[PDB]
Amino acid sequence: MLLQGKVALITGAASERGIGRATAEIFAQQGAKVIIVDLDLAQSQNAAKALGEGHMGLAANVANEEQVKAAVEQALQHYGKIDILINNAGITQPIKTLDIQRSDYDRVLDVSLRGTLIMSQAVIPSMKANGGGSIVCLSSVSAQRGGGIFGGPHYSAAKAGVLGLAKAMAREFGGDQIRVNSLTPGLIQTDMNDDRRHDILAGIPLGRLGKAQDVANAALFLASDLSAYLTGVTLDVNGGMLIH
Amino acid sequence: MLLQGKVALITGAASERGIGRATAEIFAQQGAKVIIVDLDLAQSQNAAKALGEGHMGLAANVANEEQVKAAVEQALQHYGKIDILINNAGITQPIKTLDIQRSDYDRVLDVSLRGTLIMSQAVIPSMKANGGGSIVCLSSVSAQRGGGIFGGPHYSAAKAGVLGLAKAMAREFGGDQIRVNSLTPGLIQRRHDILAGIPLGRLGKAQDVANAALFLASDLSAYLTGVTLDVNGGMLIH
Amino acid sequence: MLLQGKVALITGAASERGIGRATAEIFAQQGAKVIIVDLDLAQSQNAAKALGEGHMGLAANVANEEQVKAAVEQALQHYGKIDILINNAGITQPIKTLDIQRSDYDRVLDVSLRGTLIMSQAVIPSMKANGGGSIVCLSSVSAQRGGGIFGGPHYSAAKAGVLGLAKAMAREFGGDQIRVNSLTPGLIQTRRHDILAGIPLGRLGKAQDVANAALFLASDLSAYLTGVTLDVNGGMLIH
Amino acid sequence: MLLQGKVALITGAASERGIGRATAEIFAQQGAKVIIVDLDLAQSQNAAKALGEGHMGLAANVANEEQVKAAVEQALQHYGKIDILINNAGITQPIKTLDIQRSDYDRVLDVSLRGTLIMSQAVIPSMKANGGGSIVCLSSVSAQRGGGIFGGPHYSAAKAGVLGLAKAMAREFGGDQIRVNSLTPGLIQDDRRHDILAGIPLGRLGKAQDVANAALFLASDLSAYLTGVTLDVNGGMLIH
Numbered sequence: 001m002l003l004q005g006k007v008a009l010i011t012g013a014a015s016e017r018g019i020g021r022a023t024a025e026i027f028a029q030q031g032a033k034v035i036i037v038d039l040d041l042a043q044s045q046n047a048a049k050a051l052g053e054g055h056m057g058l059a060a061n062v063a064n065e066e067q068v069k070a071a072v073e074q075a076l077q078h079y080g081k082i083d084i085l086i087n088n089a090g091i092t093q094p095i096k097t098l099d100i101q102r103s104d105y106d107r108v109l110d111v112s113l114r115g116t117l118i119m120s121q122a123v124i125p126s127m128k129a130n131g132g133g134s135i136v137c138l139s140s141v142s143a144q145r146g147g148g149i150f151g152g153p154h155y156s157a158a159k160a161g162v163l164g165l166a167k168a169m170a171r172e173f174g175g176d177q178i179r180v181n182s183l184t185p186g187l188i189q190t191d192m193n194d195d196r197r198h199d200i201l202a203g204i205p206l207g208r209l210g211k212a213q214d215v216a217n218a219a220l221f222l223a224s225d226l227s228a229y230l231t232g233v234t235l236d237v238n239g240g241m242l243i244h
Numbered sequence: 245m246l247l248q249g250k251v252a253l254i255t256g257a258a259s260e261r262g263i264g265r266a267t268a269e270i271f272a273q274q275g276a277k278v279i280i281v282d283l284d285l286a287q288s289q290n291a292a293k294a295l296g297e298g299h300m301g302l303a304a305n306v307a308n309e310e311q312v313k314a315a316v317e318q319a320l321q322h323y324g325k326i327d328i329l330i331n332n333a334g335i336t337q338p339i340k341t342l343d344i345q346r347s348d349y350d351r352v353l354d355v356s357l358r359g360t361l362i363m364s365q366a367v368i369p370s371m372k373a374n375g376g377g378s379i380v381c382l383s384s385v386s387a388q389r390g391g392g393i394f395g396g397p398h399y400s401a402a403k404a405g406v407l408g409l410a411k412a413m414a415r416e417f418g419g420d421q422i423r424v425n426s427l428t429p430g431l432i433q434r435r436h437d438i439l440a441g442i443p444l445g446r447l448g449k450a451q452d453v454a455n456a457a458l459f460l461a462s463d464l465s466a467y468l469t470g471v472t473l474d475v476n477g478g479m480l481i482h
Numbered sequence: 483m484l485l486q487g488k489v490a491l492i493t494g495a496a497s498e499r500g501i502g503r504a505t506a507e508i509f510a511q512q513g514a515k516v517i518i519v520d521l522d523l524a525q526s527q528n529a530a531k532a533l534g535e536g537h538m539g540l541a542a543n544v545a546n547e548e549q550v551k552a553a554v555e556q557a558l559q560h561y562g563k564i565d566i567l568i569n570n571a572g573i574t575q576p577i578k579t580l581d582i583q584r585s586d587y588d589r590v591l592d593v594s595l596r597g598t599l600i601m602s603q604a605v606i607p608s609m610k611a612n613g614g615g616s617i618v619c620l621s622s623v624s625a626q627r628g629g630g631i632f633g634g635p636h637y638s639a640a641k642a643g644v645l646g647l648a649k650a651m652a653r654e655f656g657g658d659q660i661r662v663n664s665l666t667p668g669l670i671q672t673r674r675h676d677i678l679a680g681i682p683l684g685r686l687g688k689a690q691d692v693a694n695a696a697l698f699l700a701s702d703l704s705a706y707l708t709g710v711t712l713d714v715n716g717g718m719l720i721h
Numbered sequence: 722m723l724l725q726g727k728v729a730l731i732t733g734a735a736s737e738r739g740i741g742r743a744t745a746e747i748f749a750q751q752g753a754k755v756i757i758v759d760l761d762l763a764q765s766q767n768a769a770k771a772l773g774e775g776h777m778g779l780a781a782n783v784a785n786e787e788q789v790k791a792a793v794e795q796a797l798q799h800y801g802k803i804d805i806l807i808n809n810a811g812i813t814q815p816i817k818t819l820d821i822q823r824s825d826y827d828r829v830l831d832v833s834l835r836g837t838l839i840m841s842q843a844v845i846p847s848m849k850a851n852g853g854g855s856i857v858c859l860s861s862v863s864a865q866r867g868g869g870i871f872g873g874p875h876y877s878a879a880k881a882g883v884l885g886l887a888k889a890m891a892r893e894f895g896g897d898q899i900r901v902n903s904l905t906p907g908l909i910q911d912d913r914r915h916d917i918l919a920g921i922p923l924g925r926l927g928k929a930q931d932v933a934n935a936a937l938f939l940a941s942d943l944s945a946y947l948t949g950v951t952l953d954v955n956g957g958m959l960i961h
Contacts, residue, residue: 160408
């Protein structure tokens with residue numbers, strides 16, 4: 001029970017087959033109580049109920065400061081603490097550089113980058129008061145190698161911005177024992193019928209796509225005491241797609 | 245004459261003491277014609293005239309699509325091409341994580357990240373038609389080491405986002421011979437404490453960054469794309 | 483347990499205060515049977531018996547092909563398989579660039595780099611035949627930041643060489659499901675005040691911190707990780 | 722003239738079509754006097770003579786401490802200084818992990834890693850006495866991505882070791898204004914080549930001149946604030 005007695009908040013975890021839900025499931029299996037925060041309250045509550053007993057579902061647009069703060073307050077009122085924050089919320093968009101409109105940039109940057117800032121801002125005060133915590137930020141191999149997988153350049157930019165933000169927060173809050181680390185998943189199977197799949201898989205030494213559970217297990221590592229001396233780390237979960 | 249016959253557009257180069265102006269000066273010394281794009285028209289025109297003859301100054305907020313489009317069109321009308329784009333425009337703010345407000349995030353992200361996207365989007369079509377080009381993006385050591393110098397976490401995020409965008413554009417446009425690379429300057433001219441962690445024992449100069457931009461803009465780097473080039477005096481070795 | 487039913491060979495784990503022994507202890511706690519390989523037979527046997535029941539201690543210089551072959555053969559004859567290889571053996575020397583002599587270079591490079599190659603060469607065939615495995619290599623933050631901690635430039639070079647070797651083996655054997663990853667520990671408890679000032683988490687590393695990262699890489703929790711360099715440095719190097 | 726008045730020592734530059742010779746040519750074009758150090762004295766002297774006037778060829782196995790020291794002494798006696806050291810000497814071998822014998826490891830590590838240490842050790846004292854210098858070490862994309870190009874794992878290891886050594890020397894000698902930086906070339910000029918080429922965004926293999934031009938940047942005052950840098954010259958083959 002790596003997360004026995006811990007409380008974890010995971011954004012974007014209402015969807016059944018997503019990385020967020022897989023992380024919630026594994027966290028609950030490891031003894032944590034999980035707060036799922038996503039756009040739809042009913043979907044978030046149903047996901048939390050599916051995890052088991054003692055979990056919570058809340059609704060928030062991660063780019064809405066006041067809604068995020070209100071949701072975090074409800075979580076803190078019930079659980080009294082948040083030990084772990086998984087900033088998993090994020091959207092991709094398979095368009096190319098010259099097709100990125102202002103509204104596309106805003107949507108993609110808001111969910112990943114602004115949402116990570118806002119949710120981290122909302123949780124950090126209680127983590128300081130509680131003597132520490134672990135924040136895991138979701139980036140992407142696209143931020144490191146310059147896309148070429150699915151998400152367009154604004155997604156690569158947003159997820160690279162997440163890395164810069166995470167490292168800056170790691171440095172600022174190390175003295176408060178708030179560890180901040182990032183995951184850079186490769187090509188992960190979620191919601192492969194195109195011939196382009198062959199080229200990508202040919203570039204993965206392990207010879208398979210990633211699973212949501214693979215990312216969840218790396219998040220478990222960073223959320224747990226097994227990584228107590230890690231902060232500012234970028235942990236690649238890409239099957240060798242990017243070795244560097 | 246490393247940039248003989250070339251045309252370079254440099255954003256944020258109107259101020260005399262900035263990296264942008266230092267880059268414009270060195271580029272002009274190396275034979276390039278320079279288009280300075282900055283917020284103030286008169287300041288940009290005066291900076292261009294200070295470089296010498298044949299240069300141009302235009303006014304645009306890099307985060308304003310309409311103003312950027314008008315500036316690039318004026319530049320192309322006069323020069324017929326843009327060989328080099330230096331996305332130097334950027335602002336910083338020394339505020340910590342919990343104090344970053346929506347307007348702070350928007351301002352800092354807009355000048356660096358959105359500005360790099362908008363200006364690159366405006367110039368890339370002509371570069372594709374003209375057989376290639378060199379785009380240099382300005383990041384920061386803060387994007388790599390997690391701040392701790394001056395700019396707050398939203399600056400670190402914006403400059404890290406610039407790296408991600410630059411690499412994505414490098415991959416997309418390699419077949420068009422549009423090279424896209426980034427500079428990660430260290431502390432460029434409390435200072436004593438930072439200076440103690442710099443192996444070369446001095447702060448960076450605007451000319452140091454300009455010379456690295458010159459390398460990336462010139463044919464000396466014809467086989468480099470997607471590169472992040474540290475200009476930090478050893479402050480960050482990794 | 484995370485390593486239930488697994489067999490792990492750990493080099494350099496005879497000493498009680500080392501990263502190797504801490505890794506052996508945590509691996510045994512997680513259900514693995516551990517083969518300790520180190521220079522002294524009696525010390526390695528005593529360390530293996532201290533872990534519990536069903537473990538093994540063998541003597542070998544990791545830079546000696548014949549001794550490594552003999553040790554791996556004895557381990558395979560008893561356990562029939564090696565699921566996990568922790569290339570923890572390594573030595574350091576606090577000497578500066580101009581003072582590194584041929585014998586200093588040879589000793590430091592042999593234990594870390596040549597030893598990682600020789601031990602990996604000896605274990606890979608059985609891993610390939612058995613359907614995969616996990617190899618963890620021990621590097622150092624010194625390989626990334628250019629020393630400045632304790633080990634001299636030949637130590638930084640040796641541990642950087644380990645990274646290059648590990649990545650090359652990761653790429654070669656990915657299709658065989660042999661994962662190869664590296665740890666880059668910071669300053670571990672195995673002048674301190676000055677270094678401590680540059681560590682955001684405000685403490686030095688513990689052998690258990692490195693062991694726990696090795697546990698992650700050795701376990702199925704990292705089944706999709708190969709070619710990774712995993713920093714265990716408390717924020718000393720953020721990059 | 723980016724290297725006007727400078728003296729540069731380049732190892733492994735005797736061969737006509739190599740990166741070393743291309744670097745020597747470009748350095749000479751930029752005003753430097755070049756000392757070519759390679760295994761064969763006759764080949765090195767002929768290469769230096771081909772550069773133009775005022776250059777020098779010397780013989781040394783970079784893994785022989787005393788021969789390297791004697792060669793550097795001859796260079797310093799003639800030129801009085803060495804401003805720039807290009808540790809270009811290196812050999813590769815296309816053999817896979819399980820086929821690397823002790824002798825293969827020794828040969829590959831000796832030319833690249835031990836040779837870089839020995840030649841740097843031999844030149845650094847004069848650079849300290851002269852107020853600084855620039856040392857450029859030759860690594861490879863193989864050290865970063867884990868091979869897969871041509872050189873086997875021991876080549877990837879040797880070239881990664883070079884990076885670790887270079888960064889350590891950069892940190893040690895920054896106060897002496899001895900800059901130490903590394904180049905990581907990609908695939909530099911059939912099925913294997915075609916497959917690799919398909920993963921290069923710029924759509925071509927590198928040329929020796931591409932690497933030489935990056936060495937010129939690092940050797941020149943254009944990079945005066947760079948030390949400890951790893952500069953990729955790979956056409957986008959590895960973006961990271």
